[PDB]
Design a protein around this ligand. Sequence first.
Ligand SMILES: Nc1nc2c(ncn2[C@H]2C[C@H](O)[C@@H](CO[P@](=O)([SeH])OP(=O)(O)OP(=O)(O)O)O2)c(=O)[nH]1
Ligand SMILES: Nc1nc2c(ncn2[C@H]2C[C@H](O)[C@@H](CO[P@](=O)([SeH])OP(=O)(O)OP(=O)(O)O)O2)c(=O)[nH]1
Ligand SMILES: [Mn+2]
Ligand SMILES: [Mn+2]
Lengths: 176, 178
Amino acid sequence: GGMLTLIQGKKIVNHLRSRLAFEYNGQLIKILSKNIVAVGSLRREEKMLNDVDLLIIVPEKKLLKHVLPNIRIKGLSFSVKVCGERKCVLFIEWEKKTYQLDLFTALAEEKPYAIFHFTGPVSYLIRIRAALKKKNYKLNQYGLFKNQTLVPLKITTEKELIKELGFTYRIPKKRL
Amino acid sequence: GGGGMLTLIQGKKIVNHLRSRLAFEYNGQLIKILSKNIVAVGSLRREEKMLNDVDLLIIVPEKKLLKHVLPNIRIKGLSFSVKVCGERKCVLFIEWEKKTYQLDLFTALAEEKPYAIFHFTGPVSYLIRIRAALKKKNYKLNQYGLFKNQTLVPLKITTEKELIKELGFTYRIPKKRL
DNA sequence: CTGGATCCA
DNA sequence: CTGGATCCA
DNA sequence: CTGGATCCA
DNA sequence: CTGGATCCA
Ligand SMILES: Nc1nc2c(ncn2[C@H]2C[C@H](O)[C@@H](CO[P@](=O)([SeH])OP(=O)(O)OP(=O)(O)O)O2)c(=O)[nH]1
Ligand SMILES: Nc1nc2c(ncn2[C@H]2C[C@H](O)[C@@H](CO[P@](=O)([SeH])OP(=O)(O)OP(=O)(O)O)O2)c(=O)[nH]1
Ligand SMILES: [Mn+2]
Ligand SMILES: [Mn+2]
């Protein structure tokens, strides 16, 4: 995995938006643009990137075993380092260089929690999570939990989630 | 794979050799591990004819020692290299009588002993049936204890035999478990 | 069935 | 802070 | 490698 | 309707 600039990251994401699909029992299902979310240091607009992180929103639980393991990227040369249902790491060829692409999956119901988790940075996530831990809550990429039971927040966006958790909303680049 | 297959008796002779030769460094103090706190487990305890490795469970008196026992293990006089080594699992490739074998070391705390022995004895298929049955009654059995809702259920038991009976199963000697 | 060592995310 | 993939145990 | 019950095309 | 997939303790 080589080092990328922000500008290169954005250009790679633009190329992938239209070209991600997966094979579901011998049928090629296209992944929709609205279900593809740039996360990690790219969403945070860091000028240096070690990789490109994309979150894929999966409409149904039964598709989890198919999406990342049978991933297709039309016309692009890549090799797969590790791949399960929730994280898949590809090495993509881009013009005499090799870049690390990380793909992650969230179910529709996990969406804002996954976006929050994968946006980071880690330092920010630790503060937030410790603050909720003190109130006996547990936050991860799948939900908010109290006593190992899911807390039913009824929210769509990452912004709604953050307000509902009782924290000051900050744009991805201003989180630290 | 790491090591060659051994006969049962080869495995036992290796265990007999190692019983009086395991030690660890506790801040430069070299402490011998007691034979009483070493239990042969895995296919050796089940008395299978051929073994793919040797599994030993080391019983550790106190929690503070877990960061020292396996990470600073010593087998004086024996030639070996390390595959992986943490506090709960250390795997070694040992030289015994001019062939290379895999030696698995595991640690259990004193309170965990009967659960650990049960875990590491196997066989795997047997353990899965036992655990599935307890899972259906909302328990979780592992090498550290029996749990109900991520909370330790303190059984008044000491040995593996007592544990297997208290869990509501028919006790079978290691070699009869399938 | 359940979890460890490693190296990430 | 909290969890995933790999290859085991 | 739960394994019988229950769901759903 | 029933059989393969998924549920659940
Ligand atoms: N809770 C938690 N989340 C973590 C962690 N590491 C990465 N993540 C999540 C948040 C990160 O923004 C995202 C991608 O991680 P990674 O690629 Se290692 O770092 P990222 O912030 O993108 O910067 P870069 O890729 O190093 O440029 O995954 C972590 O340790 N704990
Ligand atoms: N719960 C559970 N326990 C497992 C598992 N694999 C190994 N173990 C435990 C039980 C085994 O008897 C023990 C040693 O494993 P391993 O060395 Se892979 O098999 P073992 O029975 O010694 O046969 P051999 O080493 O192949 O001769 O560790 C497992 O999948 N689940
Ligand atoms: Mn990244
Ligand atoms: Mn073994």
